[PDB]
Design a protein around this ligand. Structure first.
Ligand SMILES: Cn1nc(-c2cnc(N)c(-n3nnc4ccccc43)n2)nc1C1(c2ccccc2)CC1
Length: 822
């Protein structure tokens, strides 16, 4: 029984559970035990929940950040439905009450017992909220489509829950014996060694003696550091760098001076080094698992006796305003002097105080930790800044989580990608961040779905494969049913990869209609038909990919031959006519990050009352250079619309009219007025979005138009001006904005106003963009690798200037794009 679950986890995570045992590591074994129990206890509480509370887990509410409408309602065991005339201000309970009264007149004879399931979707309508606050109703309100809902009784929901169950004394300096190496290179070898506490040094780096390349080099040298053993912070990091000199970097390796049990490491240690692109403190504290080819560094941690880092009770036992808006030595001394006044009057300034404290002097740390243990809870924004590698202390790490508990399931979902990357900065497997991540994942099925995929997509990277595999296993222990649900998704993606491999080969050997017909024949096979059907969309668990519409499936002509997979659902009808894009060969992490950042911009705008009709379509990396994209139906690229093909309704005399004529054929008469507003709003939003994010390499092939008039951008191959990029304005768009007139200044000044507003709103939450992009440096992304990358945002947002100076600077950049526009 349990054996099947193990073999299931192994296949799902893509790593055998025997691999964890084979290492014979007690840190791993202790993580597996402690977290399993934690996740099994998390699974237990879930079984003793209420039916509404279970709906809050399985299907969390999709809400938005008067006027009547038609709504179709049916009951679970019947085809017969009723169409009502409800208001957008109505609660689902009133709609549920109408459905029960209309059932009673048909059947010839309480709303609080039911829930409204969205037809052919893992979405529900409940809670004291008006219908126009629900994301599904709003999708139906703007498109004009009729919403279809199903009355699901408390007993049927409770049936689902049931079928889905399971010390200061050591004053000598820190020193090490650098014994020998086992590397490969072309010259002499030097071992540079430093002691770090996050981004900064505890003492100055000490180098080794130049020993000839004759690999398998021997030093047997005693390296001393200008720091006392008693001064070593709990999270102290000993970092090594091996390089060739007559500079050529060869490899790097880091290790924690204390273990997971808080004991100071002593003795002989073999360090399997990682290849180099000089000293890398941010890099992993675990060795290269490629012991076969990886270079090794033999070092000795000298004994000082068993010494454990002191417990919290022992640690606890032992012109100010003008600068508080990078600081000189005298200024640092000021903040440390008036450290008590910071706790009392500037709690949010905790970050600046944590950076001025001398972590290389243990008495200074104890005083800081004493202030931290009695420090007031920080706002979510400040707690996000504290998760950065700049704050490596465990007690600091704990404080950040403590302040992040007030995060809503909506807020946490938005920053989940960033919180997952931060796991790479973690020094030990058992951490307060994982316990928080798992805890929230097991209390919300949507959080858990995306936690899984964010971890599973990185299993091909050896440095994080152990950590992630272990996290994903603990999650599976807490959710046996979800593990199976996730397995179905993996089976589909497995088949998609093989089908794509065929398409890739065939496209080089025959014509497109021939390859297309054989993709279809391959899809129609029993194993393919069964695997590609009846699964929760990995891009959105609430979207159900039911029957695969094989005839409507195809592939794309770009280098990587991306797959176009279409679906259909009877129950959902038109909300079940969903499409996905499978791409293999390109890394989709940046694309996801860019779409998430655009998705947040849209949230920050919608909170301020402004809806710039953005298209935040899904993008999810799933494996090694593998991922998915959400199809935006009834949309086409600018280029395809501009190709002005014959026999069509969009016959344009001039190129500038290509877009407007297309919108005319898709929006007739009084429908076009709406489409032009949709275009103007979305154009304004994407103009500011692309400018702030610094998206380059823009052409008619990567800009798309919805049939509703809504403009959007695809394929974000380059961001932060990494190819300083300017604002972009195209004559064909200005023409649409101006309703198809050479001079329509009033429609353009309104457009210029949408840009300024969007720009001012983003600037107010500028720090939110800085803190998130700073945590994203942990991903490895080459275009977001250093501080110079972060600098583009500081400039594009102008966060060191006043609103009047920044709005003027924006007008200058807007005028430079208008002049460049032909
Ligand atoms: C009708 N159509 N719709 C799309 C579409 C819709 N939603 C998307 N999300 C999307 N995205 N987005 N990112 C992407 C990155 C690579 C490829 C597409 C990407 N593309 N593409 C087409 C065309 C097409 C479609 C099928 C076959 C041949 C040609 C070009 C005309």
């Amino acid at each position: 029984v349990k054996k099947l679950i193990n073999s299931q986890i192994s296949l799902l995570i893509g790593k055998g559970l025997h691999e964890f045992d084979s290492l014979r590591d007690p840190e791993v074994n202790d993580f597996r035990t402690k977290m399993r129990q934690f996740c099994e206890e998390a699974a237990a509480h879930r079984q003793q929940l209420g039916w509404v509370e279970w709906l809050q887990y399985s299907f969390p509410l999709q809400l938005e950040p008067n006027r009547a409408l038609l709504v179709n309602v049916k009951f679970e065991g019947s085809e017969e439905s009723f169409t009502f005339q409800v208001s957008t201000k109505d609660m689902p309970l009133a709609l549920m009450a109408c459905a029960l009264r209309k059932k009673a007149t048909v059947f010839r004879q309480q709303p609080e017992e039911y829930a409204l399931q969205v037809n052919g979707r893992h979405e529900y309508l409940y809670g004291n909220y008006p219908l126009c606050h629900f994301q599904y109703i709003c999708s139906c309100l703007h498109s004009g489509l009729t919403p279809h809902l199903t009355m699901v009784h408390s007993s049927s929901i409770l049936a689902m829950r049931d079928e889905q169950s399971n010390l200061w004394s050591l004053e000598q300096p820190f020193s090490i014996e650098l014994i020998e190496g086992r590397k490969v290179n072309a010259m002499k070898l030097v071992v540079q060694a430093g002691l770090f506490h996050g981004n900064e040094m505890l003492c100055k780096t000490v180098s080794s003696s130049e020993v000839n390349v004759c690999s398998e080099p021997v030093w047997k040298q005693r390296l001393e550091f200008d720091i006392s053993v008693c001064d070593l912070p709990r999270m102290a990091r000993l970092c090594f760098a091996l390089y060739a000199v007559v500079d050529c970097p060869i490899a790097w390796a880091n290790l924690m001076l204390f273990d997971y049990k808080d004991q100071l490491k002593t003795g002989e240690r073999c360090l399997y080094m990682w290849p180099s692109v000089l000293l890398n403190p941010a890099g992993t504290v675990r060795g290269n698992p490629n012991t076969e080819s990886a270079a090794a560094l033999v070092i000795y941690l000298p004994e000082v006796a068993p010494v454990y880092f002191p417990a919290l009770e022992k640690i606890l036992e032992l012109l100010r305003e003008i600068l508080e808006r990078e600081l000189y030595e005298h200024e640092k001394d000021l903040v440390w002097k008036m450290r008590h006044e910071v706790q009392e009057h500037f709690p949010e300034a905790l970050a600046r105080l944590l950076l001025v404290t001398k972590w290389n002097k243990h008495e200074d740390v104890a005083q800081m930790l004493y202030l931290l243990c009695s420090w007031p809870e920080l706002p979510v924004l400040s707690a996000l800044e504290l998760l950065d590698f700049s704050f490596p202390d465990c007690y600091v790490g704990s404080f950040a989580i403590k302040s992040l508990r007030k995060l809503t399931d909506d807020e946490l979902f938005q920053y989940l990608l960033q919180l997952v990357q931060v796991l790479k900065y973690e020094s030990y497997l058992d951490c307060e961040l994982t316990k928080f991540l798992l805890g929230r994942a097991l209390a919300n099925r949507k959080i858990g779905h995306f936690l899984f995929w964010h971890l599973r997509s990185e299993m091909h990277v050896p440095s994080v494969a152990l950590r992630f595999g272990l996290i994903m296993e603990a999650y599976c222990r807490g959710s046996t049913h979800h593990m199976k649900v996730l397995m179905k998704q993996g089976e589909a993606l497995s088949k998609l990869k093989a089908l794509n491999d065929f398409v890739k080969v065939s496209s080089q050997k025959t014509t497109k209609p021939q390859t297309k017909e054989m993709m279809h024949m391959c899809m129609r096979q029993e194993t393919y038909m069964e695997a590609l059907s009846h699964l929760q969309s990995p891009l959105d668990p609430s979207t159900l990919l039911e029957e695969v519409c094989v005839e409507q499936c195809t592939f794309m002509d770009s280098k990587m031959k991306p797959l176009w997979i279409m679906y259909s659902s009877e129950e959902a009808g038109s909300a079940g006519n969903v499409g996905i894009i499978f791409k293999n060969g390109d890394d989709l992490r940046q694309d996801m990050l860019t779409l998430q950042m655009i998705q947040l911009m849209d949230v920050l705008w919608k909170q301020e009352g402004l809806d710039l009709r953005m298209t935040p379509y899904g993008c999810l990396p799933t494996g090694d250079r593998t991922g998915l994209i959400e199809v935006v139906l009834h949309s086409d690229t600018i280029a395809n619309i501009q190709l002005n093909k014959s026999n069509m309704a969009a016959t344009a005399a001039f190129n500038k009219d290509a877009l407007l004529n297309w919108l005319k054929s898709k929006n007739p008469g009084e429908a076009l007025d709406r489409a032009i507003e949709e275009f103007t709003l979305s154009c304004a939003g994407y103009c500011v979005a692309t400018y702030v994010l610094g998206i380059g390499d823009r052409h008619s092939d990567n800009i798309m138009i919805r049939e509703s008039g809504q403009l959007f951008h695809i394929d974000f191959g380059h961001f932060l001006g990494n190819f300083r990029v300017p604002f972009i304005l195209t004559y064909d768009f200005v023409h649409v904005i101006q309703q198809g007139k050479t001079n329509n200044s009033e429609k353009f000044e309104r457009f210029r106003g949408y840009c300024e507003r969007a720009y001012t709103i983003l600037r107010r939450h500028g720090l939110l963009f800085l803190h998130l992009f700073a945590l994203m440096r942990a991903a490895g992304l080459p275009e977001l690798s250093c501080s110079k990358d972060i600098q583009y945002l500081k400039d594009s947002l102008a966060l060191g200037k006043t609103e009047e100076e920044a709005l003027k600077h924006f007008r200058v950049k807007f005028n430079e794009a208008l002049r460049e526009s032909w």
